[PDB]
Amino acid sequence: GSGVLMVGPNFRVGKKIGCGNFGELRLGKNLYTNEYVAIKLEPMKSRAPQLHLEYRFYKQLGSGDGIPQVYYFGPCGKYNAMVLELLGPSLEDLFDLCDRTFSLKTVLMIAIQLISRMEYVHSKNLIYRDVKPENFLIGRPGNKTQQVIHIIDFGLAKEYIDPETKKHIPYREHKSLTGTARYMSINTHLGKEQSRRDDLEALGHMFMYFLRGSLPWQGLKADTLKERYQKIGDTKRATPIEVLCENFPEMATYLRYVRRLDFFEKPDYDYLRKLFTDLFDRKGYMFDYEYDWIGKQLPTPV
Numbered sequence: 001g002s003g004v005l006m007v008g009p010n011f012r013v014g015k016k017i018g019c020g021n022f023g024e025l026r027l028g029k030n031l032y033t034n035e036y037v038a039i040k041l042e043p044m045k046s047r048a049p050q051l052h053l054e055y056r057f058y059k060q061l062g063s064g065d066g067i068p069q070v071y072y073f074g075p076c077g078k079y080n081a082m083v084l085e086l087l088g089p090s091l092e093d094l095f096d097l098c099d100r101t102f103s104l105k106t107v108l109m110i111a112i113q114l115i116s117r118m119e120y121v122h123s124k125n126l127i128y129r130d131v132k133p134e135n136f137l138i139g140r141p142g143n144k145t146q147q148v149i150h151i152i153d154f155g156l157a158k159e160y161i162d163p164e165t166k167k168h169i170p171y172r173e174h175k176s177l178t179g180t181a182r183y184m185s186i187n188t189h190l191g192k193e194q195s196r197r198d199d200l201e202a203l204g205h206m207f208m209y210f211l212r213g214s215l216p217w218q219g220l221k222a223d224t225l226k227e228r229y230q231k232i233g234d235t236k237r238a239t240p241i242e243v244l245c246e247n248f249p250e251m252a253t254y255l256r257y258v259r260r261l262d263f264f265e266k267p268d269y270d271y272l273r274k275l276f277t278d279l280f281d282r283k284g285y286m287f288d289y290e291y292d293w294i295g296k297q298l299p300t301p302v
């Protein structure tokens with residue numbers, strides 16, 4: 001017939017964008033509004049579905065600061081598709097663009113926003129569980145949120161507050177490891193159920209990754225994922241916070257605070273934000289959204 005893929009009544013499906021995926025993320029256009037969007041695709045033949053309830057997570061998160069807007073969820077040929085707001089490049093893309101190292105001012109502007117971002121997710125009874133530079137995207141040049149750090153991909157998310165009982169999920173171990181090893185909390189490595197603290201510790205590992213240029217357990221390889229996970233975990237436990245965060249006292253304080261959080265414990269997000277805003281003010285920085293990548297040549301979907 002037409003040979004063109006449509007999602008819903010108005011979404012024309014475009015070229016696939018980004019790296020990785022393998023066809024799962026495509027540029028799209030809302031023909032009714034003449035606006036571009038991002039379209040996430042999942043083969044209806046999938047072994048491990050995630051799309052539909054991620055969509056539900058996007059709904060639960062509702063409209064929120066730094067949360068991409070979701071417009072549609074529906075069948076598209078042999079895929080299920082989720083149409084959402086198109087954003088800009090990820091922190092990982094930007095990191096490469098900035099020669100794999102961010103200034104403290106940039107990391108703090110990022111950290112302050114992400115603690116709030118994670119607190120928001122947590123306020124909706126969800127724990128993220130997929131912290132990494134690739135899942136944090138800036139907005140688009142012009143759609144006035146380009147300086148806002150957004151959080152995407154809630155495929156590994158989980159409700160940590162049982163909706164009926166209204167109780168925190170029970171503690172338990174023997175959870176299989178799947179997340180990204182480089183940033184995961186030490187407890188995640190131990191096979192323990194993840195909770196709020198774990199999202200915050202992963203953020204800490206990522207902040208240090210940005211500040212140092214790399215993490216000390218980063219190049220560990222093994223004959224089995226399980227073994228790699230075990231080596232990385234061993235090195236994380238074997239690297240003293242004071243050493244990992246040398247030259248960044250606030251980061252060391254942030255990190256050991258979260259590392260010491262109890263499984264059920266609500267993090268003191270205000271306390272964590274203040275560690276960074278006080279530092280920010282002390283260094284004489286001004287929160288003006290002028291990241292290290294500002295002025296560089298940024299990548300694009302279109």
Ligand SMILES: COc1cnc(COc2ccc(F)c(F)c2)cc1-c1cc2c([nH]1)CCNC2=O
Nearest residue numbers: 017018038068086087088089152153299300301
């Ligand atoms: C909110 O959904 C998105 C919205 N906008 C963009 C930006 O697309 C770009 C592509 C190339 C550019 F060079 C670029 F600058 C931007 C990306 C996403 C996105 C969502 C997901 C992923 N990516 C990969 C993993 N799982 C996801 O759920």
